[PDB]
């Protein structure tokens, strides 16, 4: 059959993980389910044995005065009157139900990567006096305010949000201070040029470093709405590459189809079929909402976009568009996972944080392949099969060390009939033989003893 | 103060008490079986008799993991590997289970025990990363434990189910089932290392295996018999995803004490404690030392009132040897059995606080008295009085708020102390109030009985 030979001596990017968000009170929607529904939603998102095994949670650092509509209330919703005054913190022990989701992810399911991102400063820190409708942080170049220079205050505020999480037994590992900085919206939004982002990183970095935080989070930038948009910010960011450690971008205004010129890992932090009528299907005709489509979208972001992580926009939510992976039926108190959840899971269950992408060769026409060596030495080989059932042999290169060689193998597939379902893996003399199902994503894993 | 009045408020309730007990694992049951017939009967009586012994209501058995009965090892029902987990397991039943089946049959059919907790300390060696039931190692096929020989997770679930079926076919119902013991500890004897995450992983496999089995009674899954409260409490977060698939939290009292309530929806049992290394003593009170009956009466109190425990098991019941690892001493040469006052301390609880009792509020204790109260399923109310002072005149009553048909029509009392082993004392009863002289340095239990069916 087809023989796929993994070359562990040819390496690419590290994989930090896969995930999603419950921002904008999507966590509050989850919190209103019955106990059994809450548990099923958390399980299908985070379970490493019986769900998607998502390894990254992205939270919003709320900017709004209250929890009206779907707004994320800020930890400091009321102005202290001057940026020279201590901020007025009113920690509610909830953070828009994101603290609960985070505690479950970390303490119940073993998630270790928590990305907190502000879509805006509080309104009193901004040129327009409002967390919505754009505007900029007071005190940046070209943004003087009568009320004062709020740059250090905003750095102190973000540091305090991370401290509140720490005191609630959750370590925020990555910290963002803008989202879609190129776009004014009717909801939480804030306009920074790439230059202003560099200016603010020079203030935020020493604030974190001098803080009493147990773990100093890595600063991220800038959650632009597409690859091209974020790539256009990298020149101005290059002066501060010693002071941040993660580039973030979405997949809306352009696709993750090229390697960005940055020394940092690059995460694709939001993608979705936002407008698409709800479908739970794996494959029907290759539509934009189909699980098969999203298995390939992830492949493309990793192999062509050089992404180290891939986050779907929203995990569990109500509504009937493909903006989310897991449908909440608030009436029945029920939870329905789409095959998009299982697409992201077919990746995340087997390609764990700290994996290194490695060369695989031998694929035929109708197979797209990628390989990853996990920190534990397990070698996950992804096979996306656009044809009929295919006999595939998976092995390491001749030149592989005996300590890298597998003593056992397993395989799982997602297709129309399967949700990360274990399939037979014949194992003889370092070689795993699997029948990759028609129109499936199959992951074959080679385990050392 | 016409004595100290203890007033029970039946409207204020706490946890249920499932019972009190011990184990005869690691061939301690074999040591009992070697006694002359009268010695066997005396050992069984002092453990289980509800009239003339400690009335222990729970037995904890080991699910043997060893390839043979060398040393004190518990031989497995499946000591020989089938080579591969695709192959049916090879069951080699000996009709004995390291003499635990006999102790169980006597407990259930002679003495009325209804709760039988079977716990594996290891899978058989051939199912593990180290190929041995001792020296730790992990079940093959769990996350972080892939084995050349295969994935033995389903096999181990099938094996545990089959152990329960062999008991069922020998007319004993296993009510509770554990699959690890001290999962944080590697030892030179039966031992197996699981993280809390691995335990949750295995529960997701074991639960449906039990539910689809042909067992007459589906036992409740327990976890995880950690060596202390702190160690077990640290496992609860990873276990919380499978709270719909198990029903009992278990922990020991070695590496920390049962001094706080665990955050779990399940009943919590303290399934092993002992003065393991203390020189044998049979005494109730000498100075408050680690082996004394008085100290163990207080350890039970603390586990129930401060630990929120629903059950309390001493490590071993009857055993040979010269330490306080056990409650009842066997002299294999004399063929004799000698209960310590630790046996009588646990019986001073278990005789009167029967399975299903609900802990209830009691007020009025003076400085020398520690008190707790329990409403039994039959409406009888057991009031424990632990008295560190001289003889204490005490009155025991229900709160005036009580329905007149909850109010006792009779009362009895028993005490354990340096001279008494669960000995009846006077409970003078007038107009719903029991009056007792609680002896110096004793544990006394006063029971208020409603009239019930009696004219
Ligand atoms: C000290 O230790 C105590 C334990 O020893 C501990 O007590 C525990 O307290 C918590 C918190 O108060 C209690 O949690 C509540 O539980 C309610 C359900 O309780 C009933 O079901 C339980 C589980 O039953 C399963 O397991 C048993 C054995 O495994 C079986 O006997 C059962 O058949 C059943 O098995 C089935 O299900 C299993 C999975 O669960 C499955 O594996 C199995 O195969 C099978 O299919 C019982 O244990 C419990 O029994 C108690 O109560 C009965 C009746 O009084 C007694 O007779 C018993 O002796 C025993 O004491 C019950 O039968 C939940 O409903 C409740 O959740 C609701 O409320 C919360 C908020 O508190 C809401 O967030 C939630 O959404 C729920 O809301 C619903 O109900 C409310 C009504 O109040 C309503 O307003 C709302 O709209 C909605 O409808 C909560 O989870 C827990 O039960 C206690 N345990 C026990 C054993 O009592 C105590 O806290 C400790 N103290 C301290 C200080 O820490
Ligand atoms: C893909 O992304 C990785 C980062 O995830 C890039 O790795 C960097 O490569 C440069 C140039 O060789 C090194 O000096 C950096 O130290 C690397 N960063 C890390 C964190 O490893 C890699 O260059 C990217 N690939 C392409 C084709 O652009
Ligand atoms: O510029 C026009 C484009 O269509 C954008 O609006 C798209 C792609 O860049 O942007 C996306 O719009 C929808 C956003 O979702 C919402 O977030 C706020 C919340 O209150 C709403 O309920 C959501 O619909 C998404 O964040 C954004 O990337
Ligand atoms: O880590 C060191 C500690 O002292 C542990 O050894 C203690 C308390 O955690 O653990 C206890 O050690 C003795 C064990 O009893 C033995 O069980 C196996 C049997 O073969 C032996 O004869 C017994 O001594 C006890 O189970 C354990 O809790
Ligand atoms: O490894 C396999 C798991 O991936 C599988 O998980 C299931 C995925 O589909 C969901 O609908 C189920 O709830 C979940 O259990 O279970 C089998 C296991 O071998
Ligand atoms: O109710 C009382 C029993 O608890 C008591 O049991 C005795 C306890 O001490 C043991 O040494 C004896 O063998 C045992 O009979 O017996 C008297 C009864 O009133």
* A169: contact with B, CB 8 A cutoff: no
CA R_g for chain B: 22
Q: What is the DSSP string of B125-155?
A: GGGBTTSSSBS---BTTSTT---TT---HHH
Q: Indicate yes or no: CB of A50 within 8 angstroms of CB of B204.
A: yes
Q: Indicate yes or no: CB of A36 within 8 angstroms of CB of B244.
A: yes
Q: Indicate yes or no: CB of B144 within 8 angstroms of CB of A49.
A: no
Measured CA to CA, the distance from residue B426 to residue B381 in angstroms comes to 17
Measured CA to CA, the distance from residue B326 to residue B342 in angstroms comes to 9
Angle between helices B341-350 and B293-305 (to 10 degrees): 30
Task: Give the phi and the psi of residue B302 in degrees, each rounded to 5.
Answer: -60, -45
Rounded to the nearest angstrom, the minimum Cα separation between B211 and chain A is 18
Number of H helices, E strands in chain B: 9, 23
Q: What is the DSSP string of B169-195?
A: HTT----EEES-SSTT---SSB-----
Task: Give the phi and the psi of residue B174 in degrees, each rounded to 5.
Answer: -75, 125
Q: Indicate yes or no: CB of A109 within 8 angstroms of CB of B147.
A: no
What residue owns the CA closest to ligand 3's atom 1?
A183
- The ligand placed nearest to the CA atom of residue A29 is 3
Angle between helices A151-167 and A194-210 (to 10 degrees): 50
Measured CA to CA, the distance from residue A41 to residue A48 in angstroms comes to 14
**Cα of A205 vs its chain's centroid, Å:** 22
- The ligand placed nearest to the CA atom of residue B352 is 6
Distance in Å, CA B42 to ligand 6 centroid? 12
* Residues after which a C–N gap over 2.5 Å breaks chain B: none
Q: Which residues of A touch B154 (CB under 8 A)?
A: none
Q: Is the CB of A50 under 6 A from ligand 5?
A: yes
Best residue in B138, B146, B234, B236 for a mutation probing chain A (most A CBs within 10 Å): B146
Measured CA to CA, the distance from residue B121 to residue B139 in angstroms comes to 12
Ligand 2 residue neighbourhood (C-beta within 6 Å)? A 13-14, 259, 263, 265, 306, 308
How deeply is A407 buried, as exposed, middle or buried, from its count of CB atoms within 10 A (0-12, 13-18, 19+)? middle
Q: Indicate yes or no: CB of B143 within 8 angstroms of CB of A48.
A: yes
Q: How was this structure determined?
A: X-ray
Q: Which positions ≥6 away from B431 have C-beta within 8 Å?
A: none
What residue owns the CA closest to ligand 2's atom 4?
A265
**Cα of A181 vs its chain's centroid, Å:** 18
Q: What chain A residue is nearest to B196 in terms of C-alpha separation?
A: A108
β-strands B58-62, B381-387: how paired?
unpaired
Rounded to the nearest angstrom, the minimum Cα separation between B133 and chain A is 19
Measured CA to CA, the distance from residue A61 to residue A72 in angstroms comes to 8
What residue owns the CA closest to ligand 1's atom 42?
B245
Measured CA to CA, the distance from residue B455 to residue B449 in angstroms comes to 13
Q: How far is CA A344 from CA A16, A48, A297, B297, in A?
A: 14, 12, 10, 56
Q: Which positions ≥6 away from A327 have C-beta within 8 Å?
A: A278, A280, A316, A317, A318, A335, A336, A337, A338
Q: Indicate yes or no: CB of A108 within 8 angstroms of CB of B146.
A: no
Distance in Å, CA B350 to ligand 2 centroid? 68
Distance in Å, CA A53 to ligand 5 centroid? 11
Q: What domains are defined for chain B?
A: 4-12+358-449 (2.60.40.1180), 19-354 (3.20.20.80)
What residue owns the CA closest to ligand 4's atom 26?
B315
Residue A305 DSSP class: T
Tell me the HSE value of A137 on the side-chain side, using a 13 A CA sphere.
29
User: Which among B357, B399, B375 is positioned nearest to B448, based on CA atoms?
Assistant: B375
b/e per residue A351-385 (b: at least 16 CB within 10 A): bbbebebbbbeebeeebbbbbbbbeebbbbbbbbb
Rounded to the nearest angstrom, the minimum Cα separation between A75 and chain B is 27
Measured CA to CA, the distance from residue A243 to residue A265 in angstroms comes to 14
Cβ atoms of B418 and B391 within 8 Å: the answer is no
Rounded to the nearest angstrom, the minimum Cα separation between A153 and chain B is 36
- Helical (H) or strand (E) element with A229: helix A227-231
User: Which among B71, B86, B67 is positioned nearest to B28, based on CA atoms?
Assistant: B71
> Considering Cα of A246, then A249, then A254, then A255, what sign does the dihedral take?
positive
Measured CA to CA, the distance from residue B96 to residue B352 in angstroms comes to 32
First to last CA, chain A: 26
b/e per residue B113-143 (b: at least 16 CB within 10 A): bebbbbbbbbbbbbbbbbebbbbbbbbbbbe
Q: Resolution of the experimental model in angstroms, please?
A: 1.4
Q: What chain A residue is nearest to B150 in terms of C-alpha separation?
A: A408
Distance in Å, CA B379 to ligand 5 centroid? 47
Q: What chain A residue is nearest to B242 in terms of C-alpha separation?
A: A39
Long-range Cβ pairs for the range A325-329 (8 Å, 24+): A325/A20, A325/A45, A325/A52, A326/A41, A326/A44, A326/A45, A327/A278, A327/A280, A328/A29, A328/A30, A328/A33, A328/A37, A328/A41
Q: Indicate yes or no: CB of A408 within 8 angstroms of CB of B150.
A: yes
- The ligand placed nearest to the CA atom of residue B267 is 1
Q: What chain A residue is nearest to B129 in terms of C-alpha separation?
A: A449
* B265: contact with A, CB 8 A cutoff: no
Rounded to the nearest angstrom, the minimum Cα separation between B201 and chain A is 7
Measured CA to CA, the distance from residue B324 to residue A350 in angstroms comes to 50
Pick from B148, B201, B244: CB nearest A449: B148
């Amino acid at each position: 059959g087809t023989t796929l030979t993994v070359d562990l001596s040819t390496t690419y990017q590290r994989i930090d993980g896969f995930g999603t968000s419950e921002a904008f009170q999507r966590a509050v929607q989850m919190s209103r389910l019955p106990e059994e529904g809450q548990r099923r939603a958390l399980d299908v998102l985070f379970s490493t044995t019986n769900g998607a095994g998502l390894s990254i949670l992205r939270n919003g650092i709320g900017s709004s005065p209250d929890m009206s509509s779907d707004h994320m209330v800020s930890i400091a919703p009321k102005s202290p009157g001057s940026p020279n005054n201590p901020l007025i913190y009113s920690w509610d022990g909830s953070d828009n139900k994101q603290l609960w989701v985070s505690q479950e992810a970390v303490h119940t399911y073993g998630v270790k990567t928590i990305y907190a991102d502000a879509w805006s400063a509080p309104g009193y820190m901004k040129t327009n006096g409002n967390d919505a409708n754009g505007g900029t942080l007071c005190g940046l170049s070209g943004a003087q305010c009568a009320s004062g220079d709020w740059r250090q205050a905003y750095a102190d505020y973000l540091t305090k949000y991370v401290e509140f999480y720490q005191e609630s037994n959750v370590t925020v590992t990555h910290l963002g201070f803008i989202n879609a900085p190129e776009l004014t919206t009717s909801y939480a939004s804030m306009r920074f040029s790439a230059s202003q982002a560099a200016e603010f990183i020079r203030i935020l970095y020493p604030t974190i470093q001098k803080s009493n935080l147990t773990y100093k989070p890595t600063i991220a930038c800038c959650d632009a709405e597409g690859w091209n948009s974020q790539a256009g910010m990298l020149g101005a960011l290059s002066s501060v590459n010693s002071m941040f450690g993660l580039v973030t971008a979405h997949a809306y205004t352009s696709q993750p189809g090229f390697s960005m010129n940055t020394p940092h890992p690059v995460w694709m932090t939001a993608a979705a079929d936002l407008q698409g009528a709800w479908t739970s299907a794996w494959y029907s005709y290759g539509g934009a909402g189909e699980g098969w489509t999203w298995a390939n979208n992830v492949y493309n972001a990793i192999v062509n976009g050089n992404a180290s992580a891939y986050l779907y926009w929203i995990g569990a939510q109500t509504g009937n568009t493909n903006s989310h992976m897991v449908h909440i039926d608030a009436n029945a108190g029920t939870v329905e996972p789409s095959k998009r959840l299982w697409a992201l899971g077919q990746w995340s269950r087997f390609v764990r944080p700290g994996a290194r992408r490695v060369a695989v060769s031998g694929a035929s026409g109708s197979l797209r392949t990628a390989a990853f060596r996990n920190e534990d030495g397990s070698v996950a080989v992804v096979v996306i099969n656009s044809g009929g059932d295919a006999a595939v042999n998976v092995r390491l290169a001749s030149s592989s060390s005996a300590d890298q060689q597998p003593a056992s193998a397993k395989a799982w597939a997602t297709d129309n009939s399967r949700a990360i379902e274990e399939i037979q893996a014949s194992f003889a003399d370092g070689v795993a033989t699997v029948n990759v199902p028609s129109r499936s994503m199959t992951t074959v894993v080679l385990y050392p003893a």
